[PDB]
Structure 1
Amino acid sequence: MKIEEGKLVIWINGDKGYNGLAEVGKKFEKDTGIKVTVEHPDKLEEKFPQVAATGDGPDIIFWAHDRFGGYAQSGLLAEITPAAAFQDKLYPFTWDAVRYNGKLIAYPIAVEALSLIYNKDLLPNPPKTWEEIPALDKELKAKGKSALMFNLQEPYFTWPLIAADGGYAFKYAAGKYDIKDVGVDNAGAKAGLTFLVDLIKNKHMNADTDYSIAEAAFNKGETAMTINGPWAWSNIDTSAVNYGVTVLPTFKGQPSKPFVGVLSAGINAASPNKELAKEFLENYLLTDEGLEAVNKDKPLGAVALKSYEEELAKDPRIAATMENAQKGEIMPNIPQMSAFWYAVRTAVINAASGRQTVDEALKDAQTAARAFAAAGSMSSKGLSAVARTAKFALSHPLIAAEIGYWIKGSTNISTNAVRFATRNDVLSGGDGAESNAFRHTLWQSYITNRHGIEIATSIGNAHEENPDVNLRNRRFRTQLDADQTIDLLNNQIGRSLGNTAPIGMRDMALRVLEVFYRDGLYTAKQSEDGSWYIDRTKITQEQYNSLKKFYEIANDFGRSKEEQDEIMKNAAKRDEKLLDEYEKHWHSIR
């Protein structure tokens, strides 16, 4: 029998006290006669999905709730229908962690959350608000002791501050998660990350702090506060640093919202012992006696059962973990969280380091997070042009600042190329024309010349919706289809021209003009029947001499001396008019 009827097989991980479970299973055999065998295979997170689909799994699983959402999406978990009396015996917020499609899919067993850990360096009135942390810093800075230190590289530790004023991963309602509503780049999230970066700017915290660096500083007494979970209590314990666990600080009067991970017990949909499994979990495991047996083998932290939680809350550390969990955000059980972790991790690092602004980092994060949420893949294939451009900014923040977008009067690479191509309207205007060809070729040429071929092909292909279009075809039904291949081909000739020793925009603009005159650049043309064909088009010698003369009198911005001197003197007027106004306050010679 793929799953033997008349006995229960339980799969739990090896770090959660698998021997206490079997003792509860012993009492089950004593009173019922149904054998309970507890096994702890490795790769249990990945073993069950394969065996369940073919129907060869275990009867019961113990694992975190975040993975169970994908299981039910594969139809591998049976619906849990508890009675009202038993359902009220467990904390209501724990049931919301095991709900998919509005239907209960598992039993909550335990709860885990991030919490604040302090030292006698500040034991008294530990900070209750995030806003007073910078003030206490100096106080200890004097004693030459840091104030707060927690890991900043991983978003799991930085999310509680970001989410407080309004921030989430995916919206939750009626037991369902909406993959199209993400909480990055909202007003509260921007405020939360801005406070984090402002602490770094004011040198209350260093952005390169690791998990190990934060752990070492607190264990050695060098920092008064750290943010971490119950897994690190053992290493701190050993260290005589006198540590207590309390509430996470409040931001803007609203509590921090750490991600909450609830240990859950599910039932295989292929198990013929569903009713026997429910009796074991409801009447034996999720009791004060049964949970104590598991608690003794491994501490199990805070517990969903209110009766045992109130007993376990006598330890202030466990009570604080439950309190932060109740104030926190249940980590979504949908598999689309893979998008959230990738986008948020890079955005937070870029903003904290200063390589990217908070608003731009979160905007690119939300753009990328929603994109990967669809297509269910961390792969970029088939994504939109906007998504890949945002992904490019997260991966290469500083370079994306230099490769800007068209802004009137800006001196970035993207706008300077437009100034070269649109000089005196010499080049033909419009999509699929001479001006567009010169822009793309010069734009790719300079990026290649200063950053490399692979950085240029990434940004060039990102701006195109389908960068893998067969370039052999030259006939297109729509001009938009034609212009896509025109840009792809003209990007290639630009990268070849740019793989040289570094030069300026002006001298690189001369190269594109030379090739445009003698070799030509791709341009769209409409034949009869409405179809569009593309071929390399040479430029008239006038156009060539007109632009070359102006290019030879210009800087690397695309402007002549007169055009630059107008702006420089205009800015001098603005700069010096303010100076004269300031000279009113302190009476000067002028």
Structure 2
Amino acid sequence: KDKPNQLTMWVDGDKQMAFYKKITDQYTKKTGIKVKLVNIGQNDQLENISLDAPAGKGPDIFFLAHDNTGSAYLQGLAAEIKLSKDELKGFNKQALKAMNYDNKQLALPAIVETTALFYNKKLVKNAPQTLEEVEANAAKLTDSKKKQYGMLFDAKNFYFNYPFLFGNDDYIFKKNGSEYDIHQLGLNSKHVVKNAERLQKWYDKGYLPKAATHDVMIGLFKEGKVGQFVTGPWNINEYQETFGKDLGVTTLPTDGGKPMKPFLGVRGWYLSEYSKHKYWAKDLMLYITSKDTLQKYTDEMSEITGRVDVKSSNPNLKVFEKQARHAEPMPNIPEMRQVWEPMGNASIFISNGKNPKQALDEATNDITQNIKILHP
């Protein structure tokens, strides 16, 4: 626990690098440890650290999307972070799980992301509480003529249709706590099929258009033609600009049970196994993931963070803060990469009238087969 002269961190982008410079300048004034910052996109940090780490010219702490947690660990790049309860206090419990593999905490969440339900108050006056209300608004507002839709979401994309397909008991890979069994898939369970048949019914009834893509849906919502729209927080400022006080945002509704859980995507800091100063590297991660820091972060970037004690002053983003506390992390294991395309294909097929059970069965067999190939 004897201080180094410098700690190096890899930051994702010029915007964030400017933000963390300010933050780390203060870290230096407090500890007297200089901090070198290096701008390296998160889509390139694993591959780079894979090379630079062994050469001794790697970072102490680096930044990745949580989907990579398993790979970073299996490769011997990401080191376990031992934390106290007081250190964990304040963090989103689920974001932490998203960064927990092989029963080890491997990162601290900085940014979180989920969808939520936007609504145009000129068409839907009250925030829908149940999926039945959402459907009911669909039945009322959807009209061939006006090119108006009661509800929308990119149902061909598994990322967006997940909460509509999977409730509490359902799963992608069977969970044994915070770990996943890769040989036990739940994509074609009685209940997912049943929900998939419901999805098919919405297409049949004209609620979801087969021709539109997520980008088209964004455009239609902005034209004031869409009552309700499940999507991410990415275009929030342009919806505010367009709708002002007529922009409603609420968490996803209940679906016959607990509130629906969308996927949770987390990005945060990992500790290099090749750090020669793990103790202080951690001291730095903790400083940069503090209430004080991430609060300044949310204010200045308009993104939801990995802390439940950080609060956006934007009431629309406050809804996403809540949503982020009731969400399911995208499985953080290498094998998950094999699920996206087949389920996507399944979804496309359902949209086109294919028997949903067959579609989910096909996807399941294909995922099983593909995992056996790329993950012997």
TM-score in terms of structure 2 length? 0.90
Q: Which one of the candidate residues 294, 304, 307 is aligned to 1:305? A: 307
Gap change, CA 1:257 and 1:15, over 3 Å in 2: farther
Match of 2:150 in 1: 147
> For residue 236 of structure 1, what is the aligned residue in structure 2?
239
Larger mean CA deviation between 120-129 and 69-78 belongs to 120-129
Query: 2:292 matched to which residue of 1?
Result: 289
Query: What is the match of residue 324 of structure 1?
Result: 323
How many Å separate the matches in 2 of 1:123 and 1:136?
7
Equivalent AA in structure 2 for residue 134 of structure 1: E
In the alignment, the residues of structure 2 paired with residue 225 and residue 249 of structure 1 have an alpha-carbon distance, to the nearest angstrom, of 12
Write out aligned runs for 1:440-451 (5 A). none
- Aligned 8 A contact 1:113 1:322 in 2: no
- For the 8 Å contact 1:110–1:264, the answer to whether it is kept is yes
Number of aligned residues = 369
Aligned to 1:171: 174
Matches for 1:41-56 after TM superposition, within 5 Å: 41-42=40-41, 43-56=44-57
CA displacement 1:449-485 (0-9 Å, x = unmatched): xxxxxxxxxxxxxxxxxxxxxxxxxxxxxxxxxxxxx
Query: Residues of 1 paired with 2:308 and 2:251: CA distance?
Result: 20
How many angstroms apart in 2 are the aligned matches of 1:374 and 1:322? Answer: 38
Deviation at 1:165, TM superposition (A): 6.2
SS at match of 1:151: coil
Task: Decide which structure has the larger Cα Rg and report it.
Answer: 1
Which residue of 271, 274, 279 maps to 1:270?
A: 274
CA shift for structure 1 position 238: 3.0
Question: Shift of residue 128 of structure 1?
Answer: 1.9
SS of the residue 2:187 aligns to: coil
- The correspondence for 2:228, drawn from 225, 228, 233, is 225
Instruction: Give the 3 Å change call, closer, same or farther, for CA 118–23 of structure 1 in structure 2.
Output: same
Q: Which moved more, 1:123-132 or 1:334-343?
A: 123-132
Match of residue 64 from structure 2: 63
Code of the residue aligned with 1:235 in structure 2: it is E
* Matched residue SS, 1:181: strand
**C-alpha spacing 1:123/1:316, structure 2 compared with 1 (3 Å):** farther
Q: Residue type of the partner of 2:180? A: Y
> What's 1:361 paired with?
359
- Say if 2:34 is the partner of 1:31: no
User: How far 1:193 sits from its partner (Å)?
Assistant: 1.2
Is the 1:166–1:189 contact (alpha carbons within 8 Å) kept by the matching residues of 2?
A: no
Aligned residues of 1:19 and 1:294 also touching (Cα < 8 A): no
What's the counterpart of residue 515 of structure 1? none
TM alignment of 1:105-254, pairs within 5 A: 105-141=106-142, 144=146, 145-164=148-167, 166-240=169-243, 242-254=246-258
**Identity of counterpart residues, as a percentage?**
27
Q: Give the aligned partner of residue 557 of structure 1.
A: none
How far 1:269 moved relative to its partner?
0.3
Mean alpha-carbon deviation: is it higher for 109-118 or for 158-167? 158-167
- CA offsets per residue over residues 265-307 of structure 1, 9 Å max, x none? 111000112111111122x222232223433442232x23232
Q: Distance in 2 between matches of 1:66 and 1:15?
A: 23
Question: Which whole-Å CA distance do the structure 1 matches of 2:114 and 2:142 have between them?
Answer: 29
Q: 1:164 to 1:74 in 2, by over 3 A?
A: same
Give me the whole-angstrom Cα distance separating, in 1, the residues matched to 2:314 and 2:241: 17
Structure 1 residue 15, shift from structure 2 partner: 6.9
Distance 1:137 1:290, change over 3 A: closer
Mind listing any 5+ residue stretches in structure 1 that lack a counterpart? 383-590
Shift in CA distance, 151/119, structure 1 to aligned 2, threshold 3 Å? same
1:21–1:293 Cα contact (<8 Å) kept: no
Higher relative contact order (CA 8 A, sep 6+): 2
For the residue of structure 2 that corresponds to 1:307, the secondary structure is: coil
**1:104 equivalent in structure 2:** 105
Give CA deviations for 1:411-447 in whole Å, capped at 9, x if unaligned: xxxxxxxxxxxxxxxxxxxxxxxxxxxxxxxxxxxxx
Q: 1:298 to 1:77 in 2, by over 3 A?
A: same
Which secondary structure state, in structure 2, belongs to the residue aligned with residue 239 of structure 1? helix
Q: Which 4+ residue blocks in structure 1 deviate beyond 6 angstroms? A: none
Matched position secondary structure for 1:231: coil
Alignment-derived partner of residue 345 in structure 1: 344
Q: In 2, are the aligned partners of 1:170 and 1:179 still within 8 Å (CA)?
A: yes
Give the match's secondary structure for 2:153: coil
Whole-angstrom distance in 1 between the partners of 2:234 and 2:54: 33
Q: Larger deviation: 165-174 or 259-268?
A: 165-174
Supply the AA of the counterpart residue of 2:277: N
SS in 2 for 1:351: helix
Contact 2:94-2:328 at 8 Å conserved across structures: no
Structure 1 residue 101: deviation in Å?
A: 0.9
Asked if the contact 2:9/2:37 (under 8 Å) is kept, the reply is yes
| 1:47-83 residue CA offsets vs partner (Å, 9 max, x unmatched) | 2333335553211112221112210011101110111
Question: How far off is 1:166 after superposition?
Answer: 4.2
Shift of 1:357: 0.5
Within 2, Cα distance between the matches of 1:55 and 1:178?
A: 35
Structure 2 CA distance for aligned equivalents of residues 132 and 198 of structure 1: 16
Q: Post-superposition shift, 1:183?
A: 1.9
CA distance in 1, matches of 2:117, 2:337: 27
Distance between the aligned counterparts of 2:175 and 2:51, measured in 1?
Answer: 28
Q: Secondary structure of 2:9's partner?
A: strand
| TM-score scaled by length of structure 1 | 0.59
More strand by share: 2
Map 1:560-579 to 2 at 5 A.
Answer: none
One-letter amino acid matched to 2:76? G
Task: Answer yes or no: is the 8 Å Cα contact 2:13–2:39 preserved in 1.
Answer: yes
Richer in helix (by share): 1
State the Cα distance separating 1:222 from its structure 2 match.
0.7
Q: How many Å separate the matches in 1 of 2:258 and 2:201?
A: 19
5+ residue gaps, structure 2: none
- How far off its partner does 1:350 sit? 0.4
CA shift in 2, pair 1:369/1:74, >3 Å: same
Quote how far apart the aligned CAs of 1:134 are: 3.4
In structure 2, C-alpha distance between the alignment counterparts of 1:34 and 1:183, rounded to whole Å: 49
Instruction: Find the aligned partners of 1:23 and 1:298 in 2 and give their Cα distance.
Output: 14
Considering only aligned residues, what root-mean-square deviation do their CA atoms show, in Å?
2.3
Q: Would the aligned equivalents of 1:11 and 1:58 in 2 still touch at CA under 8 Å?
A: yes
DSSP-derived class of the 1:209 partner: coil
Task: From the superposition, tell whether residues 197 and 131 of structure 1 become closer, same or farther in structure 2 (CA, over 3 Å).
Answer: same
**Aligned CA distance change for structure 1 residues 189 and 54 (closer, same or farther; 3 Å):** farther
